Amino acid sequence: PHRYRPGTVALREIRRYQKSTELLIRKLPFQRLVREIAQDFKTDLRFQSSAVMALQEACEAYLVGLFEDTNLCAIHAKRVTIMPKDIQLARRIRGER
Amino acid sequence: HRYRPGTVALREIRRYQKSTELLIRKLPFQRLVREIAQDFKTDLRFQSSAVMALQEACEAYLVGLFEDTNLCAIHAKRVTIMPKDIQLARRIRGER
Amino acid sequence: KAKTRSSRAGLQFPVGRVHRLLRKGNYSERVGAGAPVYLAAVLEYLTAEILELAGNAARDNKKTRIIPRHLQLAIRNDEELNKLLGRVTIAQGGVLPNIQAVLLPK
Amino acid sequence: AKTRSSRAGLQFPVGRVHRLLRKGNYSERVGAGAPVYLAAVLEYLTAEILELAGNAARDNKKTRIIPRHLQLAIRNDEELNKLLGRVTIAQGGVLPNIQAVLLPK
Amino acid sequence: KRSRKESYSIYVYKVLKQVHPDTGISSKAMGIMNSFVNDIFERIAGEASRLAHYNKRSTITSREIQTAVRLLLPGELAKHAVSEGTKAVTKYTSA
Amino acid sequence: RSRKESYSIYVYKVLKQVHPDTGISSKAMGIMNSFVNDIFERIAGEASRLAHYNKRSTITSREIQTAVRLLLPGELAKHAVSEGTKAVTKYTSA
Amino acid sequence: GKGGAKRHRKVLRDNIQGITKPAIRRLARRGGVKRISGLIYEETRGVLKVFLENVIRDAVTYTEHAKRKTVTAMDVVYALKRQGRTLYGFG
Amino acid sequence: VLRDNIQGITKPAIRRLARRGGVKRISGLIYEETRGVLKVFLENVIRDAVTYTEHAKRKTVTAMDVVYALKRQGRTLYGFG
Amino acid sequence: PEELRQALMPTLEALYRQDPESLPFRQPVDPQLLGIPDYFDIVKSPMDLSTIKRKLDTGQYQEPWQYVDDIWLMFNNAWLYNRKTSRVYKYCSKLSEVFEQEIDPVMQSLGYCCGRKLEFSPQTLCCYGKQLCTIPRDATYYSYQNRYHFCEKCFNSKRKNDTLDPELFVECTECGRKMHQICVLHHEIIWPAGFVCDGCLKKSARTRKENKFSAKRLPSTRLGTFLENRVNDFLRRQNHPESGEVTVRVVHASDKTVEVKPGMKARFVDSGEMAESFPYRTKALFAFEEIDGVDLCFFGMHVQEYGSDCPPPNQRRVYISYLDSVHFFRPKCLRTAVYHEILIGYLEYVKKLGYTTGHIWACPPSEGDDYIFHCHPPDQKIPKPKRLQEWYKKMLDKAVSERIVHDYKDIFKQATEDRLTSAKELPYFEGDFWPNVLEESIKENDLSQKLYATMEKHKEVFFVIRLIVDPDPLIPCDLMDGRDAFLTLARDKHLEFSSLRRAQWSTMCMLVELHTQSQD
DNA sequence: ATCAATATCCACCTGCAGATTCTACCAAAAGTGTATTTGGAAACTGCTCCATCAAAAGGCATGTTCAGCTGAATTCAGCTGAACATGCCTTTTGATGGAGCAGTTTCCAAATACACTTTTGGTAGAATCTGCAGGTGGATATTGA
DNA sequence: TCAATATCCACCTGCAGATTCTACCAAAAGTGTATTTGGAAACTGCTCCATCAAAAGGCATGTTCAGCTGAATTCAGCTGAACATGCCTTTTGATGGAGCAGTTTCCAAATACACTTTTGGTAGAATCTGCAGGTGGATATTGATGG
Hints:
G: mainly alpha; 3 helices; I: seven-stranded mixed beta sheet; three-stranded antiparallel beta sheet; 12 strands; nucleosome core (chain F); structural constituent of chromatin (chain F); DNA binding (chain F); ADP-ribosylation (chain F)
């Protein structure tokens, strides 16, 4: 049976998702999370589709930036696998923690 | 009598964290500011308070930066800072 | 007789001065009457709580005169005020005493 | 019958930028040269980033510029990158970048 | 020539006396207080103008500065701040 | 209804001047419009506060120049300033 | 209610698990991540919900300040721009 | 009086700043790069502050212009305003 | 029935044409088919549009009122078993509106004045144990023998007050038609001979006997005559085409006394500084108009007059306790002005009597509160305090221009001008704010500082106007002895002023009661 | 070193939502033209305060040593990546109720715009007061040995 | 657990700096009176948001297996830490004048406002067009198969 070594397929989707721009987080579950958060803040709210799309693209951008910083931190620690300490350090240095 | 490596280090850590006095000597920083201002426009005069504000702000920025680099060095299971730590800290901050 | 707007609102910050500075701030061509009162109240509130926190830090430091070190200790020890001034540097304040776990011996 | 945009050789509307900066109430008095100067800087930045986006599109065998081309243009120029360091381009993606140790080597 | 410079210094001094009758402030820390109060003033007023521009309102009143208090000041700080703000506007209104 | 103004025709003219045979998409055009608006507002606020600094009550080209040098990073400004000058120079020609 | 239920608000739950494992994997891959530990996913979900709470709170306070019951995109743009996330393509 | 006062920032000064930064062990290459970061931040503050300076038609930089520069770089400094 | 079919079919067909308004009501609703099993378990009468269609086609409708009642009944049970946000709810409302606007002239054609199934307001009741409070509406109440009623906290049958009392009907002599009592304006006392509809009178060339209970027949008084003459002269000067003659009658005038509250009774009169009681005269005047040949009461006013034989400071003072009006005056544009004329004339009248100071308490009522006329019209926008203050100020300025009123002030400024030092120098009136709040604060310049602050808080509310042998004899009347008795009679007998027809009916009933009260 | 099972690159072609092309309106811009106002250019000058230099002084610049930190080499439990079966729930097209966003009128409570009297904050000089910075005396954990 | 040393504190005592009191007055601030207007309510047109329905297949979810990366352990080169020794760069105070501001004049320049022309969106219909998406086959990329 043909099997690729661990990493080659990883870089395959690395280049695939660094070449494409389509949204990676599913729209309906994220919208459900948005409605949950808003309801936990204020009840009886309505959301425009464009607002949900803005939240989606924005959260994807924030996550991909944080993941780039996390990868940089992981490479700093002579590692290839991201770890909780990686994101914790990245967010601490960015200053929101 | 010889203190072990680190005891005097942590003693200075506590001493400089319990104090707020200026650490950069006034005259060399003033001269450096002078030539830096010379690099952009000639024949400038500086207020003493301007030099003090520049110096104190710069020590504050670098103190936060070394906090960041100590955290980054700890991230790699280390207690010593090396250039990769300062590169990582500045890159995560986003100045570059 | 001619009660000041600060006294009329029971505030010690000057409502009139806030109104004047907000007018010549040019943020709008028109300014409401209650806006300087409300804003002076907010600034007095912030100044108050930072003052109790600084005084508590000074008392814990065996001092009766509050110094910028006490202000830094007060603002940094309160996480809400900490992120209020998360991008602000205080003169002669220093940093909180913090030693790292791995840097500790044994 | 000469507009202020054509009078100073401007492509962006001098009248519109003047009206918008007056309407923002940044000040009580505004001179004539400031809206012209701001408009001129606007054509300058628009023109350079349009050149960059068009070059990116041509590099991608494309004749219509897209947000991906805009992101590639902005992030590949260090000065525009630092101009837009805290900035996200919608549907722009990220630059292809893999750290060396990730490569099989 | 005497050129006067304005500051919220004396009012901060009465605030300190109200919160701590037997406590004083050094000149450096007092300038720190002045810089802090000026910064808070500028941020809140700018945010109020920002909301006024956003909601197409040409007049600055207490409502949008209250909103800026909610947006800019931390949760407990913002809530208690809205508290004294409402108390003060009602007290001045009834004055 | 209320008209919503934008720099669509002007950015399109600039694009045709610099790239005659290229088109722009709607999303990219919205990014362009928000970009020009953000630069406009940032420069406007900076120049206004420069007016506040010197107790200057009038907005002229000089603090606009200062804001361009402060915000635009280096080389870009070295053209930007210049271009603006040329524009106002031409505006000071009739 | 005649039409199915009656004022079914459908109070929501378990939505953060809606951010699936492959979704976080794709987000990391766009960030150049090759290997992902098992406990990365939940803490990335935590960071996501923290960010969403912040931005949605700011936008919603914006929207009652506008005296509106529907969250638009423009107040969202305002919220992120204040939070230091300037975003294009939405106004 | 000696030139290239970038090296004039003595290595024990960087040592003391790192001690205030909580660092107990300092590598040999730390000093030069801390000097570099300091000087980079320095041309930033000097450039925008002196631009504030010719904006006022002045030949002397003021501490309040320093406050302007620091707050504009996002590093608002108190005590000199 | 076929002629009745021809009469009523167009309205039902027009209801059918409403699409998709009539679609849910075109076919008999079935709980199992529609998915709502609890429909016929709550309502005991199942029907729809098709039921009335087949009832008409068969021809078993003896009276059109059965048809109208069935239509309003499906409307009622439709709104009852429906949420207000639902689609069928608004469809039912639109169908009801179409039904009304289509059936009113068609039902008028058949001989009835109207064809509306109307119900009165929810009749609030009163308690019996404490004898002071009443039974709250839309709340838990206890009832015994349908004659005794109690609230939740009184006794410490269970029900919530939501019942609606239907409108009464009368029967014609030669028709037997169930005509509305209010709409046709038929009173048993006025015409004991028997109710005859207008159609029969027209056919027989007969006219109803002249009403001797009209407001014009009420005994005349100098004050009422002066007020009506002034109003009529003003209306004649205006000469509007919609203007009609206005009759003002004083229906109650009696001497009474006001007693000092115990709190200041201990302080002043016992010490020997203030009067123990103040005598005055209470009067009740009402304004009437002939609209469509029917008297309608559109204004009420209650005054307290302290003459020369009165201890100070109440001596020579007129105070307006309660005034009320319904906005049915024609023309509308002059209405406000006409009110001002009354508010002028009385003052001028007392100025002829030698009175010096007038007092006005300009306070609009709370929500759901009525002064004199019960059940104010829903579209009658109650004035806000500042609008009421401006309303009084306009009348004051008009009086000043006529030299009738010298000047007016607020009570705070009046006291400041008068150099008031003690609370005993403040005028005392029945039911006023000051008599109660003085005692309340006494329970809480020892007293003068509080009083001055109290006027400073509410200066704009009170008006003091700087302007004795009354030639009108006393008019004893228990029903007009205060607004409470009139309100109780209106609530008990369902005398509402919400609608013009109901206002006319209430005016007729009130006039009959006033004319029968003078018979002993 | 060759080779087979896959992913990659890419040229081509068709249907279409989006990009581009004229007509006409037109109110909101955009422009031109006086009367008005005042912000700042310009010159002279008082007064801060900034550049410069000598001696008192408080650390800064180098060589030693080895304790301990950093980093290379080895090993392995296990986990997370790769492939796959199953099906789910998200995606796309369509329609519809209607809550709610938004345009238009009215007009008043609240805003501005000076005129004026009041008090109140900012500044200069005297002189008393005081928290604290070090300096001296024990002297109390404490850490190397 | 003896012993040298930085440092918390018990106490102290002089002073730059913080606090108290009298006086002055231009600068603000509250009150008054007149004028102006921003948006609330009142009503209603109308775009779009929530909701329901139905089909279907793109990946979500789950399990399996093993590849190799993270984590632990050991140990050796050596880079920094701690410290003694020499000096030397800095801080502080005193002193000429380069320019930061205070005052006065006045003119180029920026509102205010009433017209009058120009045109940036833009409804609506028509033609054009770059690329989404599927097809097919040439071309690296991977991994371990013979030896």
